Amino acid sequence: STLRLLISDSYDPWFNLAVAECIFRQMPATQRVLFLWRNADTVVIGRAQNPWKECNTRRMEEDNVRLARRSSGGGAVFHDLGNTCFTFMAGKPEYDKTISTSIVLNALNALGVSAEASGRNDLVVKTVEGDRKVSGSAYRETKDRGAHGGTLLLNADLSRLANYLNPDKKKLAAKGITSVRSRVTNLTELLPGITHEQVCEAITEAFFAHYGERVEAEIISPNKTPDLPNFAETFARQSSWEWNFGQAPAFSHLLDERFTWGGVELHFDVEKGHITRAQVFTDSLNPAPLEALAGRLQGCLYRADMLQQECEALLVDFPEQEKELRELSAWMAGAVR
Ligand SMILES: Nc1ncnc2c1ncn2[C@@H]1O[C@H](COS(=O)(=O)NC(=O)CCCCc2cc3nc4ccc(O)cc4oc-3cc2=O)[C@@H](O)[C@H]1O
């Protein structure tokens, strides 16, 4: 056949992405793939985004909310079990992202909701409060293939959506794509009790309709590594800090705090998750260890656990300022989460 339908029973955002990443390559050029999946408590960012800048990476860590960098573009979005994800995969030149959008759109109309796409990749319903966003999307192409993945806000926690997508005021000069903040709502406010299964059928039946074929859905299990080319390597890298966080565009961070022993200001040049340069500005009466720290951060990870390593390594050479340095390491680690 020409079609392929995949349903994920895994909620690991890293897992499902690794599946697409393995389906996207393994896919025969003549094939047309639909992928239906969900994710439990995650903030998903695009390839060219800065996690610390686009979402509350600190709040997520406190609350065990995973961060995932999708291979496609777009902005930062929050995933929750009331958030349905789809992914249409075709080959060029047959591939068109408007086709997929219409399939989803037709499917929505089959359910009794009347929405239309807008912007670059939104999907907005007309409500009493006006226009509300119930979906977004992002795309990925190569020389011969294509992939249009998107969401659908069925019954996500809108509170946690706002809470994690509202980052701590940080002082950042960052390259990359920034998110386009829109007003959102849940479809359950429109079709009370709409579930993930009900939606999947619509998107599936609309997919089967526009193509005229049918196929039995292939189910993926979480308790088993799917039989895919280099999945084990894919799922491993996709899950790494070096990808989700490291593959952020080059940026800079300005830090400041007024301690009782003086004020300290830090400038961080970060690239591939690594501090390429640290500069200290202080009015402390014993600035020698701080000017020394500035050098010791040459190449250090932009992460709270490695900064504290370098600080507890500094205490050895400068034992007199043990008190002052521990306050410093405590603050420095909390500003980079
Ligand atoms: N879950 C949500 N759904 C819809 N809207 C949401 C959500 N959370 C917060 N929002 C609100 O709207 C804004 C969307 O911002 S945005 O338009 O820049 N950015 C976007 O619209 C990007 C949408 C990305 C959707 C997406 C597309 C994908 N495409 C893929 C394509 C290929 C592949 O292998 C994997 C893929 O995985 C994907 C995962 C995905 O989550 C957020 O800032 C927030 O105010």
* CATH number (domain holding residue 298): 3.30.390.50
**Spatial distance between the Cα atoms of 302 and 307, rounded to a whole number of angstroms:** 8
Question: What does the CA dihedral 304, 305, 307, 308 come to, rounded to 10 degrees?
Answer: 110
If one counts every other C-beta atom within 10 angstroms of the C-beta of residue 119, the result is 11
Place of tokens 């009015």: 283
For residue 61 the two structure tokens come to 């860590």
Write b or e for each residue in 206-227: b if 16 or more Cβ atoms lie within 10 A of its Cβ, otherwise e: bbbeebeeeeeeeebeeeeebe
Last residue of a domain, one of 248, 276, 311: 248
- CB-based burial label for 285 (10 Å; 0-12, 13-18, 19+): exposed
Task: Enter the tokens of residue 23.
Answer: 């389906």
Are residue 206 and residue 283 in the same domain, yes or no?
no
336: left (phi over 0), alpha (psi -120 to 50) or beta: alpha
Ligand 1 centroid from CA 137, angstroms: 5
Contact indicator for 328, 311 with CB cutoff of 8 Å: yes
**Helix 231-239 and helix 13-26: axis angle, to 10°?**
140
Residues paired with residue 148 on neighbouring β-strands, in sequence order: 88, 139
Angle (CA) 268-271-272 rounded to 5° is 135
Both structure tokens of 308: 């504290």
Ligand 1 proximity of 24 Cβ (cutoff 6 Å) = yes
Distance from the first to the final alpha carbon of the chain: 48
Q: CA torsion angle for 201, 220, 233, 306 (degrees, to 10)? A: 80
Phi, psi at 206, each rounded to 5°: -70, -30
User: 253 and 235, same structural domain?
Assistant: no
- Show the CA angle centred on residue 274, arms to residues 47 and 69, nearest 5°: 20
Query: In this structure, which long-range contacts are made by residues 323-331, counting pairs with CB atoms below 8 Å and at least 24 apart in sequence?
Result: 324/259, 324/261, 324/284, 324/286, 325/289, 327/259, 327/261, 328/259, 328/264, 328/290, 328/293, 331/257, 331/259
**Do 130 and 223 lie in a common domain?**
yes
Which residue segment(s) compose the domain that 315 sits in? 249-337
Name which of 290, 279, 273 is nearest 327 in CA terms. 290
Contact 72 CB / ligand 1 (< 6 Å): yes
CA distances from 3 to 25, 36, 101, 197, 327 (A): 16, 14, 17, 20, 60
Note whether 25 and 142 are same-domain residues: yes
180 and 282 fall within a common domain: no
Q: State in Å: Cα 46 to ligand 1 middle.
A: 8
210 and 275 belong to one structural domain = no
Tokens (6 digits) for 302: 């932009």
Are 228 and 269 in the same domain?
Answer: no
Per the listing, tokens 């903030």 go with: 43
Residue to mutate (ligand 1; options 24, 35, 77, 101; most atoms within 8 A of CB): 77
Whether 254 and 201 map to the same domain: the answer is no
Find residue 156's DSSP bridge partners. none
Is 133 annotated as belonging to a binding site? yes
Query: Distance of alpha carbon 71 from its chain centroid, rounded?
Result: 10
Instruction: Give the CATH number, domain containing residue 201.
Output: 3.30.930.10
- Round to whole Å and give the CA distance between 180 and 276: 29
Asked whether residue 326 is marked as a ligand-binding residue, the answer is no
Domain end marker among 194, 224, 248: 248
Return the C-alpha torsion angle 162, 168, 171, 174, nearest 10.
-50
Q: 272 with 201, same domain?
A: no
Q: What contacts 24+ positions apart, CB below 8 Å, involve 265-269?
A: 266/332, 268/297, 268/302
Distance from the alpha carbon of residue 135 to the mean position of ligand 1, in angstroms: 7
Tokens of 135: 């979906």
Give the distance (Å) from ligand 1 centre to CA of residue 227. Answer: 28
Q: Tell which of 222, 248, 274 closes a domain.
A: 248
Residue type, 26: Q
Q: Is 77 within any annotated ligand binding site? A: yes
Centre of ligand 1 to C-alpha 83, Å, is: 10
Q: Tell whether ligand 1 has an atom less than 6 A from the beta carbon of residue 44.
A: yes
Nearest to 135 by CA among 148, 147, 204: 148
For residue 284, which amino acid is it?
S
Residue 314 carries which side chain, given as an amino acid letter? L
d(CA 49, CA 174): 9
Residues 292 and 318 in one domain: yes
Between the CA atoms of 115, 116, 120 and 121, what dihedral angle is there, to the nearest 10 degrees?
A: 50
Query: Residue 143 annotated as binding?
Result: no
Does residue 151 line the site of ligand 1, with CB under 6 A?
A: yes
- Among protein residues, the one whose CA lies closest to atom 12 of ligand 1: 182
- CA 185 from centre of chain: 20
Residue 129, both tokens: 């409060």
Closest-lying ligand 1 atom to the alpha carbon of residue 180: 18
As a whole number of angstroms, the distance between CA 85 and CA 196 comes to 10
Do 88 and 104 fall within a single domain?
Answer: yes
Q: Cα-Cα-Cα-Cα dihedral of 10, 15, 16, 18, to 10°?
A: -160
Number of other CB atoms surrounding residue 170 within 10 Å: 17
Give the pair of three-digit tokens for residue 145: 């293939």
Q: How do 130-135 and 145-150 pair as beta strands?
A: unpaired
Say how many Å lie between the CA of residue 98 and the centre of ligand 1. 17
How many domains does the chain divide into?
2
CA distances from 229 to 18, 24, 101, 255 (A): 11, 11, 29, 44
For residues 6 and 216, the answer to whether their CB atoms sit within 8 Å is no
Q: Are residues 180 and 255 in the same domain?
A: no
